[PDB]
């Protein structure tokens, strides 16, 4: 057969969920596109990996005219 | 004698009767028509 | 024209509905106008016969529940997938 | 002058008209071969033609091959019969 191949799993997905207190630099989401968009106090990596730019709690939200998932960090 | 799993009235003259726990079509008119479930 | 007798449903849900169906009854609802929705039970056999007629769906019906004549129209009927049976009927106050 | 006859489709023979025998192979060569009945003899009941096949290990494959062979033989027979009739006709024509 011409079929036996598949690539190694990339362990993506949301790493830190809503309300979860994180340190700055902590990766919140590993993702392929901007499935989640960087909101307040969250930075977007080169591979669209969302990470905290400040210490605090993860806050998922729907914002904007295109109704997109935005992850912000709220300070404690 | 047509021994079948399905026995049916093949004409008006065919009558279905049960004899000693066996379904049977007997016919007054046509001898061909007479059947037995088996 | 068609006079149906109903009782107000005590218990609502899936299990309850199933029980009703088992006991040759079937859940139904009256809704429409300023008045709140009213969940009722109906005896299935009686209603099936009524619904065989084409006039059932066209005409105004009268549901008697707790000695109160509620004038309604058949709005939507849920049937059992493979049996001559009724799962549920929606009634609209006319 | 000869008319353009419609080329009739070569009809599929029925399993009712057929006898399929299965048996052990000649010489064989091993333990599994002595036991297994791979060889196939297909026989036409109305005509009396036989086709044997024991080339393959698989009985099914042999049968398929044997079936094909049988079909071919039938075709050949049909052709032969056609030819014979034709031969009669000209012989009669020759007579004139």
């Amino acid at each position: 057969t011409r079929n036996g191949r598949d690539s190694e799993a990339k362990r993506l997905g949301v790493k830190r969920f809503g309300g979860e207190s994180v340190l700055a630099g902590s990766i919140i989401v590993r993702q392929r596109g901007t499935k989640f968009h960087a909101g307040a106090n969250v930075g977007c990596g080169r591979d669209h990996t969302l990470f905290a730019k400040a210490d605090g709690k993860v806050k998922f939200e729907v914002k904007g005219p295109k109704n997109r998932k935005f992850i912000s960090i709220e300070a404690e | 004698m047509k021994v079948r799993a399905s026995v049916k009235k093949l004409c008006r003259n065919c009558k279905i009767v049960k004899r000693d726990g066996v379904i049977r079509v007997i016919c007054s008119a046509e001898p061909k028509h007479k059947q037995r479930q088996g | 024209m068609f006079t149906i007798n109903a009782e107000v449903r005590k218990e609502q849900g899936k299990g309850a509905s199933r029980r009703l169906r088992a006991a040759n009854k079937f859940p139904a609802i009256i809704y429409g106008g300023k008045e709140a929705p009213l969940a009722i039970e109906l005896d299935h056999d009686k209603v099936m016969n009524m619904q065989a007629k084409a006039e059932f769906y066209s005409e105004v019906l009268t549901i008697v529940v707790d000695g109160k004549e509620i004038k309604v129209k058949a709005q939507d009927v849920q049937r059992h997938p493979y049996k001559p049976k009724l799962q549920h009927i929606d009634f609209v106050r006319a | 002058v000869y008319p353009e006859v419609d080329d009739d489709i070569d009809i599929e023979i029925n399993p009712a008209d057929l006898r399929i025998d299965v048996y052990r192979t000649s010489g064989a060569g091993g333990q599994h071969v002595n036991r297994t009945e791979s060889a196939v003899r297909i026989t036409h009941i109305p005509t009396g033609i036989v086709t044997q096949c024991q080339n393959d290990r698989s009985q099914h494959k042999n049968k398929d091959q044997a079936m094909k062979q049988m079909k071919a033989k039938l075709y050949e027979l049909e052709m032969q019969k056609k030819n014979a009739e034709k031969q009669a006709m000209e012989d009669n024509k020759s007579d004139i």
């Binding site: 079929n3 | - | 769906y57 939507d76 049937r79 493979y82 | 698989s58 009985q59 099914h60």
Partner: protein, 136 residues
């Protein structure tokens, strides 16, 4: 024999056939043959049924085939061991749930239609029933 013209994919997973059907009511015709049983109609079977019923109705009145064999079934060749990839697509099925209107018919008297459906039914693997057009 019904089969999809094009396919997104050549082979398909086995899947499961649980649940009730969606094409439940007589939509187009006047009368229908509703599947009571759960199973899977092959393309061949469906075609046979159609043949049975058309003849019965003597080319009078319309027939609809509400089911379509869109799922390919693979069979491994004989005398072949269990490994070595998936088998080849042999035939096509429509997976049938209870409640499936399989066939529909109009432009016929009722009794005749019933008879036709009965004739059809013996060709199909699943237990079936005659059904009618319902207002609502």
């Amino acid at each position: 024999m019904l089969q999809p013209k094009r396919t997104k994919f050549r082979k398909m997973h086995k899947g499961r056939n649980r649940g009730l059907a969606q094409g439940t009511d007589v939509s187009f015709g006047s009368f229908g043959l509703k599947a009571v049983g759960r199973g899977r109609l092959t393309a061949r079977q469906i075609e046979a049924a159609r043949r049975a019923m058309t003849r019965a109705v003597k080319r009078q009145g319309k027939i609809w085939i509400r089911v379509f064999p869109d799922k390919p079934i693979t069979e491994k060749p004989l005398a072949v061991r269990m490994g070595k990839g998936k088998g080849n697509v042999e035939y096509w099925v429509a997976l049938i749930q209870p409640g499936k209107v399989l066939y529909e018919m109009d432009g016929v008297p009722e009794e005749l239609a019933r008879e036709a459906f009965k004739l059809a039914a013996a060709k199909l693997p699943i237990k079936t029933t005659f059904v009618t057009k319902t207002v609502m």
